[PDB]
Every structure is written in C-alpha cells, then in structure tokens.
C-alpha cells in the first residue's frame, strides 16, 4: 500500500528565510533527512523526529 500525500508533496520550505528546521522523507535514502523550513510559506512534509516521519512516510 502507498504512503500519505503529506509524504510526497515535496519539502517546500517557502520564500521567508530559516525558522523551523526539522526533517522530510528523502525518496532516495528512504528515511527522513533533515530540511530547513523558511518562515512564512511552503507546503507540508514537516516532521520533527525521524520515527514520527517514517510512521506516515514508511507506513504502519
């Protein structure tokens, strides 16, 4: 079964300069790699912990 949409909308931080650094699911590595969120923009794929990321991005 496939993963949720939140794990494939692509980690778009936004145009606003660094403010919520966290992680995103890297579809090469196949684990949540770190990504820096901007300030006032972006899509989703925001995950604080790698496990929490994988719960949704790897499936239960």
Alpha-carbon gap, residue 55 to 42, rounded angstroms:
22
How was this model experimentally determined?
Answer: NMR
* Residue 7 to residue 24: CA distance in whole angstroms: 8
With residue 25 as reference, give the H or E element that holds it: strand 20-26
Domains of the chain: 1-60 (4.10.410.10)
Long-range contacts, stretch 54-59, CB < 8 angstroms, 24+ apart: 54/25, 56/3, 56/4, 56/6, 56/7, 57/3, 57/4, 57/6, 57/7, 57/25, 57/32, 58/3, 58/25, 58/30, 59/1, 59/3
Q: How far apart are CA 3 and CA 10, in angstroms?
A: 13
Spatial separation of the C-alpha atoms in residues 49 and 22, rounded to whole Å: 8
7 CB-near residues (< 8 Å, 6+ apart): 25, 45, 53, 56, 57
Q: In the structure encoding, which two tokens stand for residue 8, read together? A: 């494939």
């Amino acid at each position: 079964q496939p993963l949720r949409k939140l794990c494939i909308l692509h980690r778009n931080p936004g145009r606003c300069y660094q403010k919520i650094p966290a992680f995103y699911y890297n579809q090469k590595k196949k684990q949540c790699e770190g990504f820096t969120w901007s300030g006032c923009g972006g899509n989703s794929n925001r995950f604080k912990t790698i496990e929490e990321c994988r719960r949704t991005c790897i499936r239960k």
